Structure 1
Amino acid sequence: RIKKISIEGNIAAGKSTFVNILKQLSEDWEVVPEPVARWSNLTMEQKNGGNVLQMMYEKPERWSFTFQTYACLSRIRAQLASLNGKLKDAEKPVLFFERSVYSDRYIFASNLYESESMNETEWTIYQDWHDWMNNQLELDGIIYLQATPETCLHRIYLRGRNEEQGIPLEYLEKLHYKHESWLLHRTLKTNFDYLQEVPILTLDVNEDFKDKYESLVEKVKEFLSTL
């Protein structure tokens, strides 16, 4: 009954700006934020999330498996809980996930394996881990907030985490092409077949929508009407 839509995009591309605006326009809409975004700050998960992230910055090749695995759990935990304990007696139910378990694996984990930050056994253990848990949160559509690396880079400054001032354009750039293929070009191979058929919607967020978000919202309601 509840619709499940993933908001997807690059770092600082506006996913969080979009979801904060969407939550407020309808009684019947709620968002599940990125737990990785909360770790950039505190309870068990917050400290654990705190440390693993920082360790990742110093030495990705040592910490990527651990962080990719714990990120995904934290997200799966956090989404499941919204289903089974929210949008409780609203009429036209929609949940907006900030990124997904397909992001975790097929953008993020993948990229780390391609940067040799995960060795083969870690990558293959992570996929088996990910494959088995899944078929036991499944999406009704995906919204792609599409931005260039340059836009994202500035935005990283705008909010001003220091580790991202660090984050370089070449890192943005490869995260950027991994989105086009799954989502825009539609040709990244994946182990979850229905996501070749999952309805997708793409929005340009280069322009500052902070004070001009009706054109985007209109396309979102439009999008939801066909599902």
Structure 2
Amino acid sequence: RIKKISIEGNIAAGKSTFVNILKQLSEDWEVVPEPVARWSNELTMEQKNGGNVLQMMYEKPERWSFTFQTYACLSRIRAQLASLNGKLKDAEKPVLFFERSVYSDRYIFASNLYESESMNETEWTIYQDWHDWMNNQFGQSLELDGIIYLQATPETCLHRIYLRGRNEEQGIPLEYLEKLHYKHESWLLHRTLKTNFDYLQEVPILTLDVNEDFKDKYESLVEKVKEFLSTL
């Protein structure tokens, strides 16, 4: 009976900041951060493997995209099962917030690597098949009750990457942000994007504007999330 909620949005939208705010507000509220965040960093063999392929992807995305995308999605699924069958036990009003989803894996990141030619046809169709299957064999219990879209302009995100001062992100272009921004807008706002996941097409969505700094002034955002939660 744990409520599953995806937190979605562009690079440096403030997803991590937001989720770390939410888990501290209730004893019923828990967070699963995404694998890619964990990799970008006495450390596990997923880190080991995650470290290498993220680096490999930066040199040569047209060689490594499929391997990376395949591994990122398994790593997410495992983690999401780990918290769902353990953690939050056994809350009165349990809610698990997922940082991004297997849908963002596929329809944001994997799709954009295919469109920019870092995956060929065969890789993209093997990926979608593998995706459809990995999720239907193992990921049933990962269907989302709702989605929270943190909406920021592509410009705020690039500025937010600068504010976060990580050396390796510094060369991310605004057009790359625009592609991902547009892809988010057509999946989550316009709802033009048709997935192979029919139930998604009518999952409730809460769209929040995080252009303006919320780190010291988040209560109105938290109010909107609590209202959205009761409505499910």
Q: TM-score, normalised by structure 1?
A: 0.98
User: Structure 1: how far apart are the matches of 2:113 and 2:151?
Assistant: 21
Query: For residues 27 and 169 of structure 1, what CA distance do their matches in structure 2 show?
Result: 38
Indicate if the aligned counterparts of 1:57 and 1:163 stay in contact, CA closer than 8 A.
no
d(CA) in 2 for partners of 1:47, 1:182: 33
Deviations, residues 137-175 of structure 1 (Å, cap 9, x unaligned): 910000000001111111111112222111110111100
Deviation string 1:96-142 (CA, Å, 9 cap, x unpaired) is: 00000000000010000000000000000000000011112910000
Q: Deviations over 1:66-102 (max 9, x none)?
A: 0100000000000001000011121001000000000
Rounded Cα–Cα distance in structure 1 between residues aligned with 2:37 and 2:163: 15
Map of 1:7 onto structure 2: 7
1:9-47 Cα shifts (integer Å, max 9, x gaps): 000110001000000001000010011001110210001
Aligned to 1:91, the other structure's residue is in SS state: coil
Note the alpha carbon deviations across 1:204-226, whole angstroms, 9 max, x for none. 00000010000000000000001
Q: Distance in 2 between matches of 1:34 and 1:83?
A: 14
Per-residue CA shift, 1:166-191, capped at 9, x if unaligned? Answer: 11101111000000011000110110
What is the rounded CA distance, in whole Å, between the counterparts of 1:212 and 1:55 in structure 2? Answer: 39
Q: Quick one: distance in 1 between partners of 2:121 and 2:137?
A: 25
The list of structure 1 runs, each at least 4 consecutive aligned residues, that deviate by more than 6 angstroms after superposition, is none
Give the Cα–Cα distance (whole angstroms) in 1 for the partners of residues 60 and 194 of structure 2: 29
The partner residue of 2:158 within 149, 153, 158 is 153
Question: What secondary structure is seen at the aligned counterpart in 2 of 1:210?
Answer: coil
Q: Counterparts of 1:223 and 1:58 in 2: how far apart (Å)? A: 42
Instruction: Tell me, in whole angstroms, the C-alpha distance in 1 between the residues paired with 2:34 and 2:218.
Output: 21
1:38 partnered with 2:38: yes
Aligned residues: CA RMSD: 0.9
Distance 2:73 2:165 in 1: 25
SS of residue paired to 1:5: strand
Q: Where in structure 1 are there 5+ consecutive unaligned residues?
A: none
Q: Secondary structure of the residue that 1:136 maps to in structure 2?
A: helix
SS of residue matched to 2:208:
strand
What secondary structure does 1:80 align onto? helix
Aligned equivalents of 1:54, 1:148: Cα separation in 2: 27
CA contact (8 A) 1:150 1:169 kept: yes
Secondary structure, in 3 states, of the residue corresponding to 2:207? strand
- Provide the C-alpha distance between the structure 2 equivalents of 1:58 and 1:148, rounded to a whole number of angstroms: 28
3-state SS, counterpart of residue 193 of structure 1: coil
Pick from 175, 178, 186: which aligns with 2:180? 175
Q: Is the 8 A contact 1:33 1:97 kept in 2?
A: yes
| TM score, norm. by length of structure 2 | 0.96
